[PDB]
A paper describes a structure:
The basal kinase activity of ATR plays critical regulatory roles during normal cell-cycle progression and aberrant activation of ATR signaling pathway can drive cells into senescence. In short, our study reveals a novel gating mechanism by which kinase N-lobe toggles between two alternative docking sites and recurrently commits the Mec1/ATR kinase for substrate recruitment, confined catalysis and product release.
Firstly, we determined the cryo-EM structure of Mec1-Ddc2 activated by HU. About 40% of particles have been classified into the published conformational state harboring basal activity. About 30% particles are classified into another conformation with a global resolution of 4.5 angstroms. The overall height has been reduced from 170 Å (HU-Dimer1) to 160 Å (HU-Dimer2). The conformational changes of HU-Dimer2 are condensed in kinase domain, mainly reflected in PRD, FATC and LBE.
Author numbering:
A (entry chain D): 189 to 526, 532 to 747
B (entry chain F): 2 to 32, 44 to 127, 133 to 146, 149 to 229, 236 to 331, 339 to 373, 375 to 401, 412 to 422, ...
The structure:
């Protein structure tokens, strides 16, 4: 039952693939090809530059110098070797392109586009030594641009916005900072996706200190926050969590980390999370430290997350003349970039939903991380998690459901997961809770519990008609997508085999009933019951509980 | 058919056996004790090839598993006391069920979502931190191929296995749990993205190194991994999430066409597949995603040489992409055609009742609304009054759907006619978009009214106010017309009407179905905000007398939360005295309610004290303790207290 050999492929060599792919890449949004963008680059105010058989003349073709180095080192190196060689050369490049008085940095970001395409290309057996070389080099690159993410809390009465009005060097350094943090992202996640063996060899307290510099710079509590860097930094925190949940004895890396730094991270996570979601002006500026407003100043995808309008893409192309070797970027209006259809706003409502998914998701993850307690282990997790539960319960019911916009589905799946969070709390972590905390908020926890304890009527459905009516009232947008999906985009959405038309009807029944704020899962209500109706703390003795029992019926 | 009565009694009596009470999970290992044998048997009565040619009865068989395990969540991780769970020893059992569901993709999706179940599957599993073991075996057989020394039937079975594993790692989240390590992160971009992208490189190379209908299904999945993994989150122009995956599938389709086999006749698939694929692609900016990874220059073969009449429509849409003005006016009812000397077929060249849909829809897009949606689903001023008269007719005789088929329309069109202060327009800003602070500081009082200036309300009283439905009918339709009135009055200061509001709120209390409960409360602020008659005067207090006069804690929160929200939302020293009464309601009274009053005090802080403190002191911890985190600051405000009270009271005693 053998299967014969199949070696007669005309195999494209991995090195050749890498080469051609870089050689003709065009990025998501612009108009022009990577290497040739490069071919429109001259590094002028540094009249000579040279590191390792890598001469460039004064007015020389940067881009051709690239393709030169590329091809020559081609018949030198293998795949990984070609990576690390580029990485070192481009690193020296970027470093000096950085440290220079009159130098403009046009090339830097585009080379950072390199950085991505490159390092992403094949992270299979790449070694952390090279990774960290690039990595540290860019973190301290960032501290060479640490003059960004700590710009003040607001425009002062004197601070003007009269301007050269350039979006140029703004977008320049924005791409720089972002792309750079985005490096941090990508290479650090190639770390996390490397074999577990090659891990602690990279982690020193230098990671803590350098990333501590940048984090403090980033998730400001005394400046403007900046949603993209907010993203990046916090997922690096997530990277810490990742190495925790992955290293079997993660106690190694934990002991590496410092208590003050866990604090200066989780506290700023609190600062992040007790902000709010208001699609009302997600696209303007309002109360700060409270709104993740991704303004056009920095609104595109980011080197991974295809977030939306990506409205900067072609403006990436508009940066070079795409006809002449050049050093300083081509002009763009700071304002032409960016009432037609707020459906983009609602794409983003789904995304910032994925963000608060991240918020609760990392908090869950650290929850499971600390099976044993710690110093930042303090219970304010119980407080604030339950607090968020309360607020997205009450304001949920009074505002967001019924507004015929599919944000509510994920807006509720959020707290449906926070249910698991709290139920994790009930099972595991009830050997620390402070009387201090329980009686600082006897209020909100009982609110949370009774939110489903009043839901546990379990007395709605009884037919199709009323709930399908609810649906026709609210589920308009959700059905727009339901019918786009059933009519456009699915194998399963044709030829129901007669055992799933009922699945259609009752699943839509359950989803609409679960849409209108009421009758959540039997699992939900009983798991919450195992917490309150169990008397493990004196929340609920009968003498002060039957007033709620009667307030439910009972 | 055979054990049909047995299954009927089973499902009926076990649905009866929801729990000892309505409290139904049974979170713990339950202390009957007869579900071990039936646990084994529900899957032990199905492995029989004489009962494996029918969809529905096996679907009921697997829904039996759904019920058994769903309502014994103490089954999966039950500590099979070697070291393991029973989700682990259902892994191999459900693999046979997923071999049946390999073909039935619909059933596979359902099974994945169905199977504390998934939470617990990786709750103590992540605490124990089987996956290391399975990944070792995977790498093993994976590398065992590539060179070609595998079985024939483990070949087949596990080739389907590779495809199904790819489908698993490629599906959306909200089904799978976060239980596994490698799904943790969010923003739609979590960890195994790239460990699975490394797995993708691996599968690409190995299967390039790799029965007609087999290749059919193969390219079906080649589409599928990027075809059924969308985040959508939009209107009719939805979102496909990973471009790398997109172009990778494009190039493997290229390699398949290069081989030129897996061509099977009767066209169950070819046409449909290719059509759907390029349709999806078109408008979407990833033209450049397509450009490289797949031109069909060879098998395009549109010289009458070369199922074979379906890649022609993708060639037609590529000519539409060419686009320069040579194209002309719509004649054959097809697209605005172009100079042909050509034009291949009609919008359904091959029309097995679904290919027609896909193509004709896509090609229709070549043309260079929510409000329109339901209108066409049941295919202005004239529309207004024609609606009025036709609804007179519809409530003439016991309609229940096309009758109520007008309420939401009424509302949203009130929104549009307010806006006119219908062309391309749907859900609207104040009507339907939240903001930072108070929704009800957001609303505008001195806006128009309903009486006749809104013929919407004119028809509203015409057919929905003086009706026997308000008396004793339309359990929920009479509610839907009130969500209409919701948005209506939202856009319109109403008159007092409140006769509906009052008995409506008391209804909302009892409610029977807990749907009406806070619904009235949602209603109230509309009445509360007001102008043009008792804007901010007694009107609210008038409601208040009503409300406070209601005292029952039966459906307590209806009585109480709204009681708050009104006064809450109201303006200054008025609501100040109101919150004085509210902190009275929290003062020392109905521990069920004083506490919750504090809860929603925190709530309003989310979205009086000195006066009361001094008062109660003169008269004679929780509140201040919760407020300031410690009561000792009372020194700060003790000024007007110690001086004016605490001594003159009972000159010698106190």
């Amino acid at each position: 039952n053998m299967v014969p050999l199949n070696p007669n492929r005309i195999i494209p060599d991995e090195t050749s693939l890498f080469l051609e792919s870089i050689l003709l890449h065009q990025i998501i949004g612009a108009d022009l090809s990577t290497i040739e963008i490069l071919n429109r680059l001259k590094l002028d105010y540094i009249t000579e530059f040279k590191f390792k058989n890598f001469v460039i003349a004064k007015g020389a073709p940067i881009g051709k110098s690239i393709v030169s180095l590329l091809l020559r080192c081609k018949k030198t190196l293998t795949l990984d070797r070609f990576i690390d060689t580029l990485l070192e050369d481009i690193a020296v490049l970027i470093k000096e392109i950085s440290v220079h008085p009159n130098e403009s940095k046009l090339a830097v970001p585009f080379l950072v586009a390199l950085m991505y395409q490159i390092v992403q290309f094949r992270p299979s057996a790449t070694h952390n030594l090279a990774l960290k070389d690039c990595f540290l080099f860019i973190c301290d690159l960032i501290r060479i641009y640490h003059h960004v993410l700590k710009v003040p809390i607001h425009e002062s009465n004197m601070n003007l916005h009269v301007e050269p009005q350039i979006f140029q060097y703004e977008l320049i350094d924005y791409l720089i900072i972002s792309y750079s943090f985005d490096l941090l992202e990508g290479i650090l996640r190639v770390l996390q996706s490397h074999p577990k063996q090659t891990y602690m060899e990279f982690f020193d307290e230098n990671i803590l200190k350098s990333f501590e510099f940048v984090y403090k710079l980033a998730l400001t509590i005394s400046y403007k926050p900046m949603v993209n860097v907010i993203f990046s930094a916090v997922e690096v925190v997530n990277i810490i969590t990742s190495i925790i949940l992955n290293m079997d004895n993660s106690s190694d890396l934990k002991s590496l980390i410092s208590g003050s730094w866990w604090r200066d991270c989780i506290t700023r996570l609190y600062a992040l999370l007790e902000k709010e979601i208001k699609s009302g002006d997600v696209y303007n500026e309002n109360v700060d430290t409270t709104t993740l407003h991704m303004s056009k100043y920095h609104d595109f995808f980011g080197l991974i997350r295809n977030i939306g309008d990506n409205e900067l893409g072609g403006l990436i192309s508009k940066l070079i003349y795409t006809d002449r070797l050049q050093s300083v970027p081509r002009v763009i209006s700071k304002e032409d970039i960016g009432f037609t259809a707020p459906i983009i706003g609602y794409k983003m409502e789904k995304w910032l939903l994925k963000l608060k998914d991240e918020v609760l998701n990392i908090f869950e993850n650290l929850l499971m991380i600390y099976g044993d307690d710690a110093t930042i282990v303090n219970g304010e997790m119980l407080i604030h998690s339950s607090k968020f539960l309360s607020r997205e319960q009450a304001l949920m019911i009074e505002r967001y459901v019924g507004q015929d916009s599919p944000n509510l589905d994920l807006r509720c799946h959020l707290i449906e997961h926070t249910l698991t969070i709290i139920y994790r709390l009930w099972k595991d972590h009830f050997k620390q809770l402070r009387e201090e905390q329980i009686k600082q908020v006897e209020s909100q926890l009982i609110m949370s519990l009774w939110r489903f304890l009043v839901c546990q009527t379990e007395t709605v459905t009884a037919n199709e008609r009323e709930m399908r009516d609810h649906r026709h009232l609210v589920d308009s947008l959700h059905d727009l997508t339901i019918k786009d999906q059933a009519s456009y985009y699915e194998d399963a959405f044709e030829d129901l085999p007669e055992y799933i038309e009922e699945e259609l009807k009752m699943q839509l029944n359950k989803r609409t009933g679960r849409i209108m704020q009421v009758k959540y899962d039997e699992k939900f209500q009983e798991m919450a019951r195992t917490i309150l109706e169990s008397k493990s703390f004196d929340l609920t003795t009968l003498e002060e509980a039957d007033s709620l029992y009667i307030s439910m019926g009972l | 058919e055979s054990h049909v009565k047995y299954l009927d009694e089973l499902i009926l009596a076990i649905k009866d056996l929801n729990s000892g009470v309505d409290s139904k999970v049974q979170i713990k290992k339950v202390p009957s004790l007869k579900i071990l044998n039936t646990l084994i048997r529900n899957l032990k009565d199905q492995r029989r090839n004489n009962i494996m040619k029918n969809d529905t009865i096996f679907s009921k068989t697997v829904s039996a598993l759904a019920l058994l395990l769903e309502y014994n969540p103490f089954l999966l991780v039950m500590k099979d006391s070697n070291g393991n769970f029973e989700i682990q020893r259902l892994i191999d059992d459900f693999l046979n069920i997923s071999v049946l569901n390999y073909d039935n993709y619909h059933r596979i999706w359902f099974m994945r979502r169905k199977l504390a179940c998934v939470e617990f599957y990786g709750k103590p599993a992540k605490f124990q931190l089987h996956f290391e073991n399975t990944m070792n075996l995977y790498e093993q057989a994976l590398t065992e191929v590539l060179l070609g020394k595998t079985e024939l039937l483990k070949f087949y079975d596990t080739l389907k296995g590779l495809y199904i594993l790819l489908y698993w790692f490629t599906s959306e989240y909200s089904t799978f749990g976060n239980s596994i390590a490698f799904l943790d992160s969010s923003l739609g971009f979590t960890k195994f993205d790239f460990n699975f992208q490394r797995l993708i490189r691996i599968v690409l190379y190995v299967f390039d190194s790799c029965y007609a209908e087999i290749q059919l299904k193969y390219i079906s999945l080649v589409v599928d991994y990027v075809c059924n993994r969308t985040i959508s989150t939009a209107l009719d122009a939805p979102a496909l999430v990973c471009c790398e995956q997109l172009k990778f599938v494009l190039t493997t389709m290229h390699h398949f066409l290069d081989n030129k086999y897996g061509l099977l006749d009767n066209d169950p698939t070819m046409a449909k597949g290719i059509l759907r694929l390029y349709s999806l692609c078109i408008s979407n900016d990833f033209s450049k995603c397509f450009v490289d990874h797949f031109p069909i220059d060879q098998w395009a073969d549109f010289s009458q040489s070369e199922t074979n009449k379906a890649l022609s429509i993708v060639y037609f849409d590529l000519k539409r992409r060419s686009l320069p003005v040579e194209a002309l006016k719509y004649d054959n009812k097809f697209n605005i055609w172009v100079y042909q000397s050509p034009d291949s077929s009609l919008k359904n060249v091959t029309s097995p009742f679904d290919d027609r849909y896909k193509q004709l829809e896509k090609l229709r897009l070549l043309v260079l609304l929510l409000k329109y949606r339901v209108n066409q689903l049941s295919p202005f001023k004239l529309i207004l009054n024609e609606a009025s008269v036709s609804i007179q007719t519809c409530f003439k005789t016991n309609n229940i759907t096309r009758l109520t088929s007008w309420t939401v329309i009424l509302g949203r069109l009130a929104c549009l006619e307010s806006e006119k202060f219908m062309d391309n327009w749907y859900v609207c800003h104040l009507c339907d978009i939240e903001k930072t602070g108070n929704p009800f500081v957001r609303i505008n009082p001195n806006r128009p009214e309903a009486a006749g200036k809104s013929e919407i309300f004119r028809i509203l009283h015409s057919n929905f106010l003086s009706h026997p439905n308000i008396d004793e009918f339309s359990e929920s339709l009479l509610s839907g017309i009130l969500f209409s009135l919701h948005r209506i009055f939202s856009h319109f200061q109403p008159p007092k009407q409140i006769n509906k509001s009052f008995k409506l709120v008391q209804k909302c209390f009892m409610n029977s179905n807990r749907y009406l409960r806070l619904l009235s409360t949602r209603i109230i602020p509309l009445f509360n905000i007001s102008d043009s008659h008792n804007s901010e005067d007694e009107h609210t207090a008038t409601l208040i007398k009503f409300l406070q006069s209601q005292k029952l804690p039966v459906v307590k929160e209806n009585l109480v939360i709204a009681w708050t929200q009104l006064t809450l939302t109201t303006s200054n020293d008025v609501f100040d005295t109101l919150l004085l009464k509210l902190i009275d309601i929290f003062n020392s009274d109905d521990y069920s309610l004083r506490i919750m009053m504090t809860l929603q005090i925190k709530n309003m802080a989310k979205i009086i004290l000195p006066v009361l403190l001094r008062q109660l002191g003169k008269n004679l911890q929780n509140l201040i303790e919760l407020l300031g985190y410690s009561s000792k600051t009372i020194l700060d405000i003790f000024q007007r207290y110690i001086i004016p009270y605490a001594i003159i009271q009972y000159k010698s005693d106190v």
